[PDB]
Paper text:
The production of β-lactamase enzymes, which catalyze the hydrolysis of the endocyclic amide bond of the β-lactam ring, is the most common mechanism for resistance to these antibiotics. Class B enzymes are zinc dependent metallo-β-lactamases (MBLs), which require one or two Zn2+ in their active site for catalysis. Note, the 5/B/6 MBL, which we use in our biochemical and structural studies, is a different isolate from the commonly used BcII MBL (Sequence ID: EEL64219.1). In this paper, we couple kinetic and structural studies of the free and inhibited Bacillus cereus 5/B/6 MBL to understand the structure-activity relationships that underlie the inhibition by the 10-mer DNA.
To put the mechanism of inhibition into a structural context, X-ray crystallography trials were initiated for the aptamer-free and 10-mer-bound enzyme. The 2.5 Ångström (Å) resolution crystal structure of aptamer-free 5/B/6 MBL with both Zn2+ ions bound is shown in Fig 2. Our structure shows a similar fold. This result suggests that His263 plays an important role in directing Zn2 to its location within the active site by acting as a gate locking Zn2 in place once it is bound. Among these residues were three lysines (78, 104, and 107) on loops L4 and L6, shown in the crystal structure in Fig 2A, that make up a basic patch. The shortest distance between the active site and inhibitor binding site is 25 Å, as measured from His116 to Lys78 –too far away for the aptamer to interact directly with both sites. 200 models of the complex were calculated using our X-ray crystallography model and a hairpin model of the 10-mer aptamer, which was calculated in 3D-NuS.
Author numbering: 36 to 257
Write the structure that this text describes.
């Protein structure tokens, strides 16, 4: 259990194992602190993030923290849906020549929310390799948003569930303004059906757990 932080504590990275870390940032909204999780992947050919952060201020500092820790550059990011906590650092990414991967739909919705457009290069099942690190993206259907995807790391059996999966502490689904609450259950079932061997599940917000987080989210939807 190893967490690196900036001095304020607004940005932290937590070790799941040597090459996979959770990044978490606090964005403040009407006096209220909200954490958001993504992943940091340490690969032979650079660093890969799953999701950016609330804004460019945080995204830029996040990048510098990880580039210093691992002594190499952030080359790619995978955007799991078009909300601010996921997509708010797009300008930082473009400015630094960091490729922003997404589904066409996510790219479409990003444009329509006024954000810079990610690549729209991902299909519903896409396998990527960065150095020796394998990354699978999967669209399970509508849930938290229309466009939400999950990121699977087959070599670690680690699932970045994003906001499709709630933490164990969550007692409601949170922000459902853009959600499809009647399809969300099916969409989690598609995840459960596809990955029979989940060791860790990282939710969009809150503590890392395991396969249980997906069952908890199903309860929250009943
Ligand atoms: Zn969201
Ligand atoms: Zn979320």
């Amino acid at each position: 259990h190893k967490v690196i932080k900036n001095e304020t504590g607004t940005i932290s990275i937590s070790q799941l194992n040597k090459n996979v870390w959770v990044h978490t940032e606090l964005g403040y909204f009407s006096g209220e602190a909200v954490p958001s999780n993504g992943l940091v992947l340490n690969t032979s050919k650079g660093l890969v993030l799953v999701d950016s952060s609330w804004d460019d201020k945080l995204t830029k500092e996040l990048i510098e923290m990880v580039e210093k820790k691992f002594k190499k550059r952030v080359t790619d990011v995978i955007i799991t849906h078009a909300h601010a906590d996921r997509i708010g650092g797009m300008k930082t990414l473009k400015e630094r020549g960091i490729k922003a991967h997404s589904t066409a739909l996510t790219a479409e919705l990003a444009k329509k929310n006024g954000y810079e457009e990610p690549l729209g290069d991902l299909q519903s099942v896409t396998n990527l390799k960065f150095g020796n690190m394998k990354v699978e993206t999967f669209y399970p259907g509508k849930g938290h948003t229309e466009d939400n995807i999950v990121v699977w790391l087959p070599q670690y059996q680690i699932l970045a569930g994003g906001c499709l999966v709630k933490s164990a502490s969550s007692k409601d689904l949170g922000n459902v303004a853009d959600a499809y609450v009647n399809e969300w259950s099916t969409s989690i079932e598609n995840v459960l059906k596809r990955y029979g061997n989940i060791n860790l599940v990282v939710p969009g917000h809150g503590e890392v757990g395991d396969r249980g987080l997906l069952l908890h989210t199903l309860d929250l939807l009943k």
